[PDB]
Amino acid sequence: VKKLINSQISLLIGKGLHEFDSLRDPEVNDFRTKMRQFCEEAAAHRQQLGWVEWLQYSFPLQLEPNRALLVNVKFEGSEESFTFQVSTKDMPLALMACALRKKATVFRQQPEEYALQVNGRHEYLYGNYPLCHFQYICSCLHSGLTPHLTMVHSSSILAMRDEQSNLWSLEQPFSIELIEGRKVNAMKLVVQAGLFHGNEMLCKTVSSSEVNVCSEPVWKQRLEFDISVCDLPRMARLCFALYAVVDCPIAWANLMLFDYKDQLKTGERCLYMWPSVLLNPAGTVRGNPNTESAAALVIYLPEVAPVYFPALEKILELLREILERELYEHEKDLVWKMRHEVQEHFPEALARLLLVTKWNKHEDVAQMLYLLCSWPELPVLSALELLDFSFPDCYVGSFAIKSLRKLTDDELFQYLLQLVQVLKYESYLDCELTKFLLGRALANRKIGHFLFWHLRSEMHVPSVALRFGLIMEAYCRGSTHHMKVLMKQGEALSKLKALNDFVKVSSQKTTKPQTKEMMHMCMRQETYMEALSHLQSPLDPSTLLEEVCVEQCTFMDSKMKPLWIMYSSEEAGSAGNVGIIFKNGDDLRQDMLTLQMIQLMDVLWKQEGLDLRMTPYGCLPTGDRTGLIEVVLHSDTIANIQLNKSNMAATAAFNKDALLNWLKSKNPGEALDRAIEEFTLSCAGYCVATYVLGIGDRHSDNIMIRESGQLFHIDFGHFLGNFRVPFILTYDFVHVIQQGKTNNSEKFERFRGYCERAYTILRRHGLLFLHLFALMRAAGLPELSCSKDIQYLKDSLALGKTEEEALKHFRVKFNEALRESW
Numbered sequence: 104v105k106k107l108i109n110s111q112i113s114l115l116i117g118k119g120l121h122e123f124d125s126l127r128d129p130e131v132n133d134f135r136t137k138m139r140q141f142c143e144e145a146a147a148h149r150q151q152l153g154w155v156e157w158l159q160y161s162f163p164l165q166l167e168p169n170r171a172l173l174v175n176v177k178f179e180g181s182e183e184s185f186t187f188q189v190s191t192k193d194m195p196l197a198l199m200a201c202a203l204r205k206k207a208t209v210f211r212q213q214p215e216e217y218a219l220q221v222n223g224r225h226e227y228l229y230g231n232y233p234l235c236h237f238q239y240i241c242s243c244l245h246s247g248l249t250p251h252l253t254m255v256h257s258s259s260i261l262a263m264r265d266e267q268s269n270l271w272s273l274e275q276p277f278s279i280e281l282i283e284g285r286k287v288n289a290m291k292l293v294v295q296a297g298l299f300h301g302n303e304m305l306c307k308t309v310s311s312s313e314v315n316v317c318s319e320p321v322w323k324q325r326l327e328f329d330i331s332v333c334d335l336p337r338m339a340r341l342c343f344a345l346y347a348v349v350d351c352p353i354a355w356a357n358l359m360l361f362d363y364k365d366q367l368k369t370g371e372r373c374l375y376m377w378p379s380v381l382l383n384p385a386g387t388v389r390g391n392p393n394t395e396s397a398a399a400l401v402i403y404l405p406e407v408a409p410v411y412f413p414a415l416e417k418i419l420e421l422l423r424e425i426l427e428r429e430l431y432e433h434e435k436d437l438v439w440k441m442r443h444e445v446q447e448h449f450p451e452a453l454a455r456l457l458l459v460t461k462w463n464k465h466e467d468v469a470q471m472l473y474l475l476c477s478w479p480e481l482p483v484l485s486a487l488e489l490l491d492f493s494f495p496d497c498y499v500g501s502f503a504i505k506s507l508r509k510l511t512d513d514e515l516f517q518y519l520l521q522l523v524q525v526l527k528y529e530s531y532l533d534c535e536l537t538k539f540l541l542g543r544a545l546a547n548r549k550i551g552h553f554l555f556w557h558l559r560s561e562m563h564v565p566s567v568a569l570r571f572g573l574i575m576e577a578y579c580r581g582s583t584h585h586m587k588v589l590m591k592q593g594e595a596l597s598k599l600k601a602l603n604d605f606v607k608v609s610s611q612k613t614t615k616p617q618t619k620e621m622m623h624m625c626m627r628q629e630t631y632m633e634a635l636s637h638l639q640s641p642l643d644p645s646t647l648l649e650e651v652c653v654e655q656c657t658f659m660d661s662k663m664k665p666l667w668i669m670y671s672s673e674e675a676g677s678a679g680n681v682g683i684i685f686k687n688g689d690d691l692r693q694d695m696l697t698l699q700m701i702q703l704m705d706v707l708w709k710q711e712g713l714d715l716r717m718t719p720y721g722c723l724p725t726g727d728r729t730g731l732i733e734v735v736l737h738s739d740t741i742a743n744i745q746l747n748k749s750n751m752a753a754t755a756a757f758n759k760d761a762l763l764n765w766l767k768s769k770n771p772g773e774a775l776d777r778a779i780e781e782f783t784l785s786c787a788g789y790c791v792a793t794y795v796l797g798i799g800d801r802h803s804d805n806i807m808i809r810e811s812g813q814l815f816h817i818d819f820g821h822f823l824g825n826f827r828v829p830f831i832l833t834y835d836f837v838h839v840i841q842q843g844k845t846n847n848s849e850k851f852e853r854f855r856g857y858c859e860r861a862y863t864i865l866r867r868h869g870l871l872f873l874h875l876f877a878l879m880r881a882a883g884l885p886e887l888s889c890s891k892d893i894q895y896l897k898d899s900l901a902l903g904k905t906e907e908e909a910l911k912h913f914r915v916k917f918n919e920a921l922r923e924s925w
């Protein structure tokens with residue numbers, strides 16, 4: 104039984120558990136045994152939460168960042184239902200009290216015993232929150248539709264919970280022996296090396312003597328470093344590069360000088376090197392698992408006596424305002440001098456101080472660390488910055504995690520992508536971030552869900568495979584039931600892969616309608632219907648994908664032939680009609696990042712009461728160049744609409760009317776006005792979003808309208824101006840905002856203010872986007888490579904300017920954009 108769990112975990116994570124043992128590594132072993140006890144205590148805890156609390160775990164509330172409305176309510180084991188008027192201000196409890204008073208008459212005869220489920224979703228309404236604080240209610244309030252909800256009793260929910268049970272002495276300079284290698288090139292070999300603490304070098308880099316591009320090369324050289332061993336910080340990192348010359352990089356490799364047990368390291372080491380794009384401090388500190396093929400450097404760490412890093416007690420024992428809002432040496436000096444007063448009157452400039460403290464002087468570091476332990480907790484925003492690679496020191500990390508704990512799950516979810524990337528930076532397996540992500544993922548099934556996928560999605564990447572795999576195994580130890588739910592998901596994804604593969608070959612030999620019939624046959628196979636049905640959508644686990652409508656499924660006409668999968672739910676009705684797009688072949692990371700940053704803008708706007716009617720559809724990479732997009736129904740490309748087909752409702756004398764006619768036919772009479780509004784708001788939003796983010800090559804083929812008028816974007820290939828992309832006003836948008844008039848400066852300038860608000864709001868959170876992008880550098884995304892990329896943001900948000908200025912700046916670009924418009 105314990106045996107079956109293991110094989111399930113193996114299949115689930117994409118790596119077999121035997122491989123962890125085969126490593127014969129105490130670091131891994133400890134991480135495994137430790138992290139299991141932890142996840143087991145969490146899982147233990149959970150099985151004894153009260154029912155409401157279990158709901159909170161299982162399906163956390165989805166909330167928005169007087170007026171009448173019709174609601175429909177039913178009770179679980181029955182079809183009969185009732186329609187009430189309520190106020191949008193009513194508590195979920197008031198509604199539940201009605202439900203019951205209605206029932207008990209149609210039946211002859213306590214609201215606290217119930218929670219309201221959304222029909223056909225893993226979504227629930229509970230708490231003291233007026234109805235439309237719940238996203239679902241408020242959402243309905245807009246698209247116009249009637250909320251449909253099911254009274255679920257406490258006995259019913261608890262049944263679910265049930266079914267889910269399971270030192271300073273050493274003064275001599277540091278130096279190593281470089282012995283020999285085993286590599287491939289054309290010319291002389293060289294081995295350069297430096298000691299890093301983050302991005303900063305601890306002293307000048309040193310080099311090898313020029314040998315023949317030959318062997319199996321030999322060196323047997325002392326390389327001595329311009330620093331004394333006693334000054335080596337905890338997180339000291341030794342970084343190698345190997346290249347040829349007579350310029351030409353071959354491989355690289357890094358290691359920590361202290362092991363995970365704080366022991367300094369001796370003596371011989373074989374390093375299996377990673378092939379190159381010279382020195383790479385950010386690169387991982389464990390070796391290339393491809394031992395057969397990979398080049399290897401063998402070194403000798405001299406044995407300086409056994410030595411550990413001193414305990415914390417031993418550590419603990421041992422116009423400035425004007426600058427303080429890059430700095431000269433002299434300034435650096437003043438800051439350091441004022442450290443105490445920094446910790447007293449500018450605690451939020453911590454990051455600035457840490458950047459001036461001398462990491463290659465053990466005495467200075469001890470001073471810095473002493474101030475850290477009395478340091479007041481910082482705001483979340485400051486914590487996100489402290490996770491930067493610039494801050495490799497784990498006492499700082501511990502502090503940053505310490506400050507990060509007051510994250511709401513919503514915030515946590517909103518940054519989860521980035522926190523995962525930072526795991527790639529971690530010098531050791533057992534660490535605080537890992538401990539924290541696991542703990543929060545265990546207290547929240549939604550967080551649990553996405554963490555897994557973020558991790559499961561990168562197992563094809565050898566540098567993170569082990570780390571990630573070990574985390575996923577830990578999590579499963581913490582959630583036997585959720586791992587079943589997830590296998591269901593990965594089983595569906597496996598089938599989709601096989602289906603898409605068939606689609607690629609077939610689509611080259613034959614015509615679309617034929618491949619479509621073939622697809623449906625393959626899908627109608629027993630193994631496919633079972634695999635592809637009755638699951639939770641990986642794009643959002645509260646979305647249930649029940650019955651695939653084979654008849655509706657097809658594939659899209661682009662190189663990779665992405666699949667189009669429609670699902671219905673009888674229990675869910677209309678909002679059980681959902682689609683996903685399976686994509687195998689393209690990298691989805693770029694888009695997912697893009698989609699999350701827009702999502703962020705929307706939350707920011709909404710937190711200041713600006714609702715631009717955005718459309719944040721799911722996008723979720725699941726594996727090697729494989730993931731899913733959320734289908735947005737009742738929409739079409741501008742281009743498609745501008746095919747302006749005769750026979751359709753939008754038959755137009757001039758192409759500029761096409762959109763507006765379409766909108767008219769979907770939105771008769773007084774509905775028309777609302778749709779123009781929806782179009783205007785969301786346009787404002789996507790214009791500002793594409794502009795700040797440097798997303799370009801927008802054309803009518805990658806912009807979509809929905810029948811509500813809402814406009815949104817697909818196919819993000821390029822961002823951060825990655826061919827300075829202008830602001831863009833398409834003539835046809837302007838025309839639609841202007842209600843079909845040549846001049847409508849009333850309508851048009853309202854539109855300007857929306858942009859201006861959206862833009863100005865984002866700037867106030869400029870730093871929040873910077874820190875997040877900072878953290879993304881860890882990803883290896885090709886258009887997220889360096890500083891010039893983070894420069895793009897600085898410039899778009901005109902962050903260094905004043906609001907009066909920036910607005911002025913933005914006003915030119917926006918004008919420039921209107922001029923372009925015919």
Ligand SMILES: COc1ccccc1-n1c(SCC(=O)Nc2ccc3nccnc3c2)nc2c(c1=O)CCCC2
Pocket residue numbers: 657658659660661667720732733734735736738740817
């Ligand atoms: C691959 O996309 C195409 C490229 C060239 C020509 C046509 C398509 N294409 C297109 S082009 C529209 C498009 O490229 N993408 C869409 C269409 C709807 C979307 N909804 C939510 C999120 N993204 C969406 C993206 N659409 C469809 C199909 C299709 O083959 C098949 C049936 C379902 C809709």
